[PDB]
């Protein structure tokens, strides 16, 4: 009734409280429950939002490139990438003392600096870069593209440029353009980049923009592509002793498929990735021609899903009516996209610590763990968001009339069975994992390590033996010689793979001890429990047995009242709350496992892991209590050093964690009375009753309370673990 900030809430405007401020800062991106937000006026806003967020990403990358070019020692890294370490940015903080300027001066060419853990030097030099000007250029380019997207987001807002509604429902042509253009064409351009610049830079050649107009990337240039015999491009690869900054034993091959590692740089051959991305681009181009268009016949979607119907009725209607269901719902596509993005983020994190694509990258021992944990938590949050939007689908966009007989209704019908079996697998994993850990702890406490249980992971070791591993001796595929899998592909990628697999020093199919069994089962427990929480919050969304009409109160509501014996945290948003707690736990267990595995591996004492990864006292002593001495000694009366800021941030993380507990344990009602008391006191202070607050102070909403509590929880968890992973690694180097 009373108009004020914001512009998109008439009910929250009459609200005489600071609550409307928080709900405006929160619901500013919820562009579906606002007043008068019909469909066709929403796609253009979300599209401008895509432009804005892309501009943010490009401006981020531009700032990174700029601080690398001007404040980073990229010149000091290319020449001798082993004797030097990266630098991120400088410091103009007046709060530092004289010892502080002397402690943050690892470089020596400037004042206080900070190490660069982004891993950008390796990825920028593998693609070919040996000058800071080449970095300034890219930074300016990214700033320009950010501005371009900021403008393009606005251009489609005024008429004569506003799109229509039928332009979005045409999923066929858009998916064609994305599979072919967004993936295939860009991949082929990337192959061109690798073959015209990255390779010449690997030969120490200073080949860039000013000279590629006549440089033949291959003798008999482009003629084999005209006159057949493609094999002519894979006849002289990089020599085993190839230098990457110079041309010490170089080659003229561009499309190589030897499938190995570049010994000096310790990464995949710079020429393998060219043929890699070329095959990827060809295959994505083949994929991008599947659909019906204006004049391209292909085959449309409505006739495919309605044809996938098992005749025996195992599914019923099969997939009839799902085209109109998915195409008319954005939360379902968002759930699918976030699920795929999270799973492929985990996949990329798995593939980056095992198949290094970047030259001079595996030698660095700090950016690896940082980037891996980065992508792990990113994938965890993206998966939790995928499940959250999957529940929002059932809550907000669902029409069971159209869905009378599809697989989604069937899935909703036996939801109790799914939830019960998730609960059962979780119970099994938890019971047995905790039981074996407690057993090993009690057995070690009695001083008889022989009496512990150590299940030998025969399955993963068997799969490794099939990969080419011989440490286990199972006489399997790619390990024996009486099989077609070992014979075929002998001049192919097999030699490099088999040579890199039996190496007991690189991270590629590590020697698996029984201590990996227990931790993989703990990870399975964490995954099954998080998935239980999410699937339960999602399936019991339209209506549960306690709250049948749950579809009426939306998605994020505090509770349904203290009636019926107690109803707390019953909304699906609260299940998402708890599932984010479990996501933090699961990703933390995964990161502890990976970190301590590679930590026992880097000290040359993998037997330490193979012997102490069997019980919990080892995890507490050999990992947590042990590898933290530089965190405690970052600053002391003796004098601080470069590791002081990281220790103070390690404490900041714990402070944020405890504030999260503050907002989690104590709930709202308690604080309303205290706020009313403080208001009483503030209105009666003598001569302090001048110009008043503009909005009434009240206690944070219960939903808001738990949201901010989980936000503090997550952010403190992340900062603490990251400060640890960075300090306890980039301070000792061992």
């Amino acid at each position: 009734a009373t108009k004020l900030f914001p512009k998109f809430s008439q009910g929250l405007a009459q609200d005489p409280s600071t609550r409307r401020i928080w709900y405006g800062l929160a619901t500013a991106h919820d562009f579906e429950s606002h007043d008068g937000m019909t469909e066709e006026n929403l796609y253009q806003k979300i599209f401008a939002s895509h432009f804005g967020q892309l501009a943010i990403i490009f401006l981020w990358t531009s700032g990174n490139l700029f601080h690398v070019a001007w404040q980073g020692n990229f010149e000091q890294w290319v020449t001798d990438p082993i004797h030097v370490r990266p630098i991120a940015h400088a410091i103009w903080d007046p709060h530092f003392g004289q010892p502080a300027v002397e402690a943050f001066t690892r470089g020596g060419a400037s004042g206080p600096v900070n190490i660069a853990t982004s891993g950008v030097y390796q990825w920028w030099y593998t693609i070919g870069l040996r000058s800071n000007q080449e970095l300034y250029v890219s930074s300016v380019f990214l700033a320009l593209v950010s501005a371009v997207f900021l403008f393009a987001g606005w251009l489609h807002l005024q008429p004569n440029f506003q799109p229509s509604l039928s332009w979005f429902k045409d999923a066929e042509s858009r998916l064609n353009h994305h599979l072919a253009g967004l993936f295939g064409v860009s991949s082929l351009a990337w192959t061109g980049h690798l073959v015209h610049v990255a390779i010449p830079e690997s030969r120490g050649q200073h080949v860039g923009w000013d000279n590629f107009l006549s440089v033949l990337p291959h003798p008999q240039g482009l003629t084999p592509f005209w006159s057949g015999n493609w094999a002519a491009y894979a006849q002289n690869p990089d020599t085993a002793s190839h230098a990457f900054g110079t041309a010490d034993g170089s080659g003229t091959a561009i499309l190589t498929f030897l499938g190995g590692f570049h010994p000096q740089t310790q990464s995949l051959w710079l020429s393998d990735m060219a043929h890699h991305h070329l095959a990827i681009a060809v295959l994505f181009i083949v994929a991008g021609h599947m659909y019906r268009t204006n004049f391209g016949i292909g085959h449309r979607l409505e006739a495919i899903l309605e044809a996938h119907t098992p005749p025996a009725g195992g599914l019923g209607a099969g997939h009839k009516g799902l085209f109109h269901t998915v195409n008319n719902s954005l939360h379902f596509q968002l759930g699918l996209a976030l699920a795929s993005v999270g799973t492929i983020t985990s996949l990329v994190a798995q593939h980056m610590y095992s198949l290094p694509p970047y030259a001079y990258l595996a030698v660095d021992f700090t950016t690896q763990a940082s980037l891996y944990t980065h992508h792990q938590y990113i994938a965890g949050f993206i998966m939790c968001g995928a499940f959250a939007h999957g529940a929002i689908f059932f809550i907000r966009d669902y029409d069971p009339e159209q869905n009378k007989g599809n697989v989604l209704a069937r899935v909703l019908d036996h939801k109790e069975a799914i939830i019960s079996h998730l609960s059962w697998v979780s119970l099994f994993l938890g019971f047995h994992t905790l039981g074996l850990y407690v057993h090993n702890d009690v057995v070690q406490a009695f001083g008889t390590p022989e009496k512990q249980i150590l299940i030998e992971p025969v399955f993963a070791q068997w799969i490794q033996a099939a990969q080419g591993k011989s440490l286990y001796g199972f006489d399997l595929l790619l390990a024996s010689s009486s099989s077609p899998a070992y014979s075929a592909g002998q001049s192919l990628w097999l030699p490099g793979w088999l040579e890199a697999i039996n190496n007991n020093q690189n991270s590629l199919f590590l020697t698996i001890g029984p201590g990996d069994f227990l931790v993989h089962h703990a990870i399975a427990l964490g995954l099954h429990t998080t998935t239980l929480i999410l699937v339960k919050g999602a399936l019991d969304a339209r209506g549960s047995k306690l709250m049948p009409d749950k579809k009426d109160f939306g998605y994020s509501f505090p509770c349904d009242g203290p009636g019926r014996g107690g109803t707390c945290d019953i909304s699906a948003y609260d299940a998402f709350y708890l599932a984010v707690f479990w996501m933090l736990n699961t990703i933390g267990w995964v990161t502890f496992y990976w970190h301590w595995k590679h930590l026992t591996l880097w000290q040359g004492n993998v037997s330490q892991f193979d012997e102490s990864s069997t019980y919990l006292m080892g995890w507490l002593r050999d990992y947590l209590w042990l590898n933290s001495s530089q965190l405690i000694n970052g600053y002391n009366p003796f004098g601080m050093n470069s590791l002081s800021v990281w220790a103070w941030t390690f404490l900041f993380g714990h402070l944020v964690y405890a504030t999260g507990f503050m907002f989690l344990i104590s709930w709202r009602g308690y604080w309303q009375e205290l706020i009313e008391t403080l208001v009483w006191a503030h209105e009666k202070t003598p001569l302090a009753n001048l110009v008043y607050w503009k909005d009434k102070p009240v206690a944070l909403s219960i939903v808001q309370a738990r949201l901010v509590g989980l936000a503090h929880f997550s952010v403190g968890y992340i900062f603490t673990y990251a400060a640890f992973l960075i300090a306890s690694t980039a301070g000792r180097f061992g």
């Binding site: 022989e450 150590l454 299940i455 440490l471 001796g473 199972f474 019991d540 012997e611």
Partner: protein, 163 residues
């Protein structure tokens, strides 16, 4: 030889661990006279420790580079060898005992659904009925399979759901 592991007798680390344990025991065993009680206690402890280390190394159990025993849990690797007792038969023993327990509990909770106020029977049990059913479940695999073919365990979809 499986998984790069070696039989646990040829493990130098295993024997080194046994010697370490025995030295650690004897260093504080030498604190007491051969007649007192603590001395006899440590003697018996050393007895069954030596028995631990001797009795394990029979029929074959693999110890790894750490010298500690490692259980093989795959059926097929426990076969074609002698490891069927590591975890293959314990699985069936637990399955038998867990069946037994669930069978007895289910038949109890079913036979109580017929009388008035069954809730009482869940806080004040029928001790003689529980004892009778406790001594009748050690044929449950026979009763379970044929009670499944019977159909007296499938409820014909007459329960409370929400969907």
């Amino acid at each position: 030889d499986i998984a790069g592991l070696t039989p646990c007798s040829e493990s130098k680390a295993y024997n080194k661990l046994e010697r370490k344990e025995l030295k650690v025991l004897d260093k504080r065993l030498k604190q007491y006279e051969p007649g007192s009680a603590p001395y006899l206690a440590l003697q018996a402890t050393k007895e069954r420790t030596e028995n631990r280390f001797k009795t394990y190394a029979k029929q074959g159990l693999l110890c790894g580079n750490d010298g500690l025993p490692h259980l093989i849990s795959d059926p097929g690797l426990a076969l074609r060898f002698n490891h069927a007792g590591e975890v293959f038969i314990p699985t069936f023993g637990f399955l038998y005992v867990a069946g037994y327990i669930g069978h007895v509990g289910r038949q109890y909770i079913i036979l109580s659904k017929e009388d008035a106020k069954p809730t009482d029977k869940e806080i004040i049990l029928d001790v003689p009925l529980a004892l009778k059913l406790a001594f009748q479940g050690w044929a449950w695999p026979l009763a379970s399979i044929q009670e499944l073919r019977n159909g007296s365990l499938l409820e014909k979809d007459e329960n409370i759901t929400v969907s």
